[PDB]
Amino acid sequence: RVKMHVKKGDTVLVASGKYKGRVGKVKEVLPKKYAVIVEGVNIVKKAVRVSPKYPQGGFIEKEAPLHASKVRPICPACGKPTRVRKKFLENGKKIRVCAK
Amino acid sequence: DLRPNPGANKRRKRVGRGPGSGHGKTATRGHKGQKSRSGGLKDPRRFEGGRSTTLMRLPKRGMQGQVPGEIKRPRYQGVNLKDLARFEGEVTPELLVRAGLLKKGYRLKILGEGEAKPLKVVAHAFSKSALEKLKAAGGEPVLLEA
């Protein structure tokens, strides 16, 4: 509904914060909190588990949601918002112009 | 000009005076102070004291209306023939209340004082001095009886 947004599980630039400009991979959309996770915010989760298994070695702990109004998608371009081209039967996301 | 100062020229008097006070209308809620001005008084134009306050007067104004009411009678407005004299032409109703006087009700009784212009008024009643005034300059016809 309103909950649909920029893009889906592809590679995408983030222009947010500390990671102002970082091309991350496939992004794993959240989106009820309107975020993705993609590759940027990598903050440490100081948690054991809920089920006590394979205990604490190091923390290379996982990512964070990264609110999705700052993940600029990519094509042979940089940024350039998505658009809709329909071609009489489909609905494809073509950027401000390069292609694709 | 701009929205800074077109503002009203120094006289609005709008201290719409709230008596929330301690200085101003000092806390007995200016004018008040005793009791029986505590949320109401009865008139005090017709009213009290409780004596008559004036019913000791007496209705001379008779023929005060049998139950169907005022007979829907003609009522002649009275213009002076000096206030008729502001214009020129065949002065008639609708050179009247179309412009100015007579307030639309029933037809016209010119009367009065002033410089009778020579012009033939089709009025619908006359005072004797108005007739004697404008026959001394002009003429007039009379009412409609159609």
Partner: protein, 51 residues
Amino acid sequence: VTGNELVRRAARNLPWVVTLAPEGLNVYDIVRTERLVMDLDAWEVFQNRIG
């Protein structure tokens, strides 16, 4: 103040134009802006509207 809606559309959307119909002239929308530009077919309706 134009009686041409296809320039009211053009000037509808600026930080410094209050667009206006030729009949909707009013002193508040006059005074809240610093300039006034009106058509001949808005000045004619304004001149015949007022005395």
